[PDB]
């Protein structure tokens, strides 16, 4: 009664028989915005079930040489579903998330993925190699939406910070000999009650292989990793027309 679990939100239900408990980001469940914390004077929309549900957005293939991937969050879920819509029509957005990364293999396979939540995950460039050029990461890299982006220098999280310390962040590992999925529940985290789901990304989801995937030849070599996230306590205010970016 700790390795098996079921997550049910909206009209979606995730099952898992090898999970390793659930992490609750910074030990705080997602809440709605207080009356004294808010400033936007208009009564917000709380679609509830139409947006607070499990969107299974992407699948990556883990290979004996994969570097790792990340997904910026507020964004990843735009354009997809009713959530996407409310995020485009409204200026202000607010919401916590239930992230469930899954990836299974056999008892004869081995490997270990680090799954973390890095708030305000600002990306940096290699500065033209030498460090004299003041380059900047492109829209395609800082806000990749679904499909995420692949890391080029995971050791420093493409941002000059050691991944060795990335665990001071809500994390969970996917050790194949132990489990087959991670489950983080992040609350809304920003220095503001609401912000634009479009141009600001509250945090990134990191999935990095720290202990390389490996298996004797002959065992199914296609080992996918699938991301499934679900917004929680979604609130929207500041209604205008629909906006893409």
């Amino acid at each position: 009664s700790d390795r098996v679990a079921q997550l049910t939100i909206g009209n979606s239900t995730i099952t898992t028989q090898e999970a390793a408990n659930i992490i609750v980001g910074y030990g705080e469940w997602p809440s709605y915005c207080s009356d004294d914390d808010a400033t936007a004077v208009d009564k917000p929309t709380r679609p509830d079930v139409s947006v607070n549900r499990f969107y299974t957005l992407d699948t990556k293939l883990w290979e004996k040489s994969s570097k790792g991937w990340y997904w910026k969050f507020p964004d990843v879920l735009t354009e997809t579903g009713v959530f996407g819509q409310n995020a485009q029509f409204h200026y202000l957005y607010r919401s916590g998330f239930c992230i469930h990364v899954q990836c299974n293999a056999s008892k004869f396979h081995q490997g270990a993925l680090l799954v973390a939540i890095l708030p305000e995950y600002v990306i940096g460039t290699v500065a033209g190699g030498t460090g004299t050029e003041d380059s900047h990461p492109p829209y395609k890299q800082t806000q990749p939406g679904a499909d995420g982006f692949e890391l080029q220098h995971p050791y420093v999280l493409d941002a000059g910070i050691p991944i060795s310390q990335l665990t001071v962040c809500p994390h969970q590992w996917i050790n194949l000999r132990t489990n087959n999925c991670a489950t983080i529940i992040v609350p809304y985290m920003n220095t503001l009650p609401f912000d634009s789901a479009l141009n600001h990304c509250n945090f990134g989801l990191l999935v990095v292989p720290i202990s390389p995937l490996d298996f004797d030849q002959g065992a199914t070599p296609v080992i996918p990793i699938t991301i499934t996230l679900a917004p929680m306590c979604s609130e929207f205010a500041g209604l205008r027309q629909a906006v893409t970016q």
Partner: protein, 296 residues
């Protein structure tokens, strides 16, 4: 009269669940006596890192321990304790001959990410709220003290930024200025937490413009206006050439600090202000290196 799912609908709970509470930690935890334990079923030493929680194994269950009354304090590891230490954050030149800042005045964009020591410390956390004490040490490039009168003026974003030593903005009718002789002890001032956000943000993953976001504009990624506090202007108080080359060192000391969301410590060298770029070719390891894991 209602529809039930509406009477339940916990939608609108403004209070956060928690799960964890804050306890008093004036001293380090004491060590209580331990004895041998030879039993099946209880395995403290065995953990599962996958969960994502740090091992909760106590020294007591790992070895027979004595009793120790730990009275060591934890006061020096608080935030005010750690961060409330003046440090260099800005430097300004007012040379006689040159191209940097002649004309006798300078406009320093208030950005504390220009000096590696102080920068790394704060970049430990994502958000930070606090008041600060700014001190300004001025003198000539030789460290020589000179009888010169300066004027430091804090210019909030929107106020008219001085265009010359004799600019009209130096009337400073609402901006707060400080007049000081370089012979007087360094000017020092108390600054409140002035920001439209609730905390300064060291890292802002996103843009502020809201437009197209082409190549030429990637300059703005990571630029959060809630930290642009305006500029700090200084000028020798006069109509003519200063007569002496000056330098002003700006030291900031935080106080009444609140920090949130700790993140990994800067691993590589810093290259630019408000931009975590790193040397692609010179990516050095976090620490030292040996010749083999089996030798020291």
């Amino acid at each position: 009269d209602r529809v039930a799912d509406v009477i339940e609908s916990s939608i609108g709970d403004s209070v956060s669940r928690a799960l964890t509470q804050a306890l008093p930690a004036p001293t380090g935890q004491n060590t209580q006596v331990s004895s041998h334990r030879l039993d099946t079923g209880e395995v403290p030493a065995l953990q599962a890192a996958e969960i994502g929680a740090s091992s909760n194994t106590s020294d007591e269950s790992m070895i027979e321990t004595r009793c120790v009354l730990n009275s060591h304090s934890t006061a020096e590891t608080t935030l005010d304790s750690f961060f409330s230490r003046a440090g260099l954050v800005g430097e300004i030149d007012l040379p006689l001959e040159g191209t940097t800042n002649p004309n006798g005045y300078a406009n320093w964009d208030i950005d504390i990410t220009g000096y590696a020591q102080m920068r790394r410390k704060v970049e430990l956390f994502t958000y930070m709220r606090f008041d600060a004490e700014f001190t300004f040490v001025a003198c000539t490039p030789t460290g020589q003290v000179v009888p010169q009168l300066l004027q430091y003026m804090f210019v909030p974003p929107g106020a008219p930024k001085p265009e010359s030593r004799e600019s009209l903005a130096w009337q400073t009718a609402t901006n707060p200025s400080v007049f000081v002789k370089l012979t007087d002890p360094p000017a020092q001032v108390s600054v409140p937490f002035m920001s439209p956000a609730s905390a300064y943000q060291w890292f802002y993953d996103g843009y502020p413009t809201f437009g197209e976001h082409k190549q030429e504009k990637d300059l703005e990624y990571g630029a959060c206006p809630n930290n642009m506090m305006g500029t700090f202007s200084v000028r020798n108080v006069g109509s003519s050439k200063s007569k002496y080359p000056l330098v002003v060192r700006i030291y900031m000391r935080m106080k009444h600090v609140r920090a949130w969301i700790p993140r990994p410590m800067r691993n590589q060298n810093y290259l630019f202000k408000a931009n975590p770029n790193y040397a692609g070719n010179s990516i050095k390891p976090t620490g030292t290196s040996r010749t083999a894991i089996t030798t020291l």
